[PDB]
């Protein structure tokens, strides 16, 4: 029935119990079935900084197009690793092996993230050179 | 209250 | 040095990075050092329910003041023994007593959303009496 | 940087 599209009150109370969420969801380990959709979340966002960074490389000097190439190469392979650790931490859960399975979760995910930071350093050092640092 | 029950159901 | 206003690229990664630590950080427990910030969070939430609330009393029949009045002094409490489990958890950081006090903070926590979610209940039901549902 | 760095020293 009632419309919320200005109900402060109704805004309020979702907004504290989001914030008793993101405050457990942190605090606990997920329910590895609960993390299919964050690995896909991960898939989206790299999806889209591998296209923006393919419309970028033209701009840049011939001379680092593979240095750039291969970087992207290396987070498409960590989005593979991390895809598999995933599938076989789902295979085990409850059983005495889903710890290790979450453990070569995350440092395949912390190895993306270090890469994806490693691509920003060699397009910004491409960015330096065509604006012509000194 | 449906997406606020998402929310409440995600507590369980 | 370099100017981040459009770039996307950098948006991209800083974008691809936030994911993976929003996946980090709900596959793994948090270190009790860590969620201060998270209870300061819903503290200000739930600050900013009951100051809405306070301005919503006076347009609802009296004839429900109390029982709302009620259920903003529970929100309250709950926050009361929320900021007690999280004092004693990072007390207890470290030692074996560690875990059942993160338990009796999601506990607390978890109480809370309810009891929220009740408030919200209390305050349609007595909007649904002035509006004049039938 | 200075705020990609504040993420990037999260993971440790």
Same mark, same amino acid.
């Given at each position: 029935?009632?419309?919320?599209?200005?109900?402060?009150?109704?805004?309020?109370?979702?907004?504290?119990?989001?914030?008793? @969420? =993101? $405050?457990?969801? #942190?605090?606990?380990?997920?329910?590895?079935? %609960?993390?299919?959709?964050?690995? *896909?979340?991960?898939?989206?966002?790299?999806?889209?900084?591998?296209?923006?960074?393919?419309?970028?490389?033209?701009?840049?000097?011939?001379?680092?197009?593979?240095? @750039? =190439? $291969?970087?992207? #190469?290396?987070?498409?392979?960590?989005?593979? %690793?991390?895809?598999?650790?995933? *599938?076989?931490?789902?295979?085990?859960?409850?059983?005495?092996?889903?710890?290790?399975?979450?453990?070569?979760?995350?440092?395949?995910?912390?190895?993306?993230?270090?890469?994806?930071?490693?691509?920003?350093?060699?397009?910004?050092?491409?960015?330096?050179?065509?604006?012509?640092?000194? | 209250?449906?997406?606020?029950?998402?929310?409440?159901?995600?507590?369980?």
């Amino acid at each position: 029935n009632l419309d919320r599209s200005n109900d402060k009150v109704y805004e309020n109370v979702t907004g504290l119990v989001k914030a008793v @969420i =993101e $405050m457990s969801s #942190k605090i606990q380990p997920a329910p590895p079935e %609960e993390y299919v959709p964050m690995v *896909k979340e991960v898939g989206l966002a790299l999806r889209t900084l591998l296209a923006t960074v393919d419309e970028t490389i033209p701009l840049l000097p011939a001379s680092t197009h593979r240095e @750039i =190439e $291969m970087a992207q #190469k290396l987070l498409n392979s960590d989005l593979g %690793e991390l895809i598999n650790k995933m *599938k076989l931490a789902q295979q085990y859960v409850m059983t005495s092996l889903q710890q290790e399975y979450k453990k070569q979760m995350l440092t395949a995910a912390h190895a993306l993230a270090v890469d994806a930071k490693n691509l920003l350093d060699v397009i910004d050092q491409a960015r330096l050179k065509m604006l012509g640092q000194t | 209250t449906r997406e606020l029950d998402e929310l409440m159901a995600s507590l369980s």
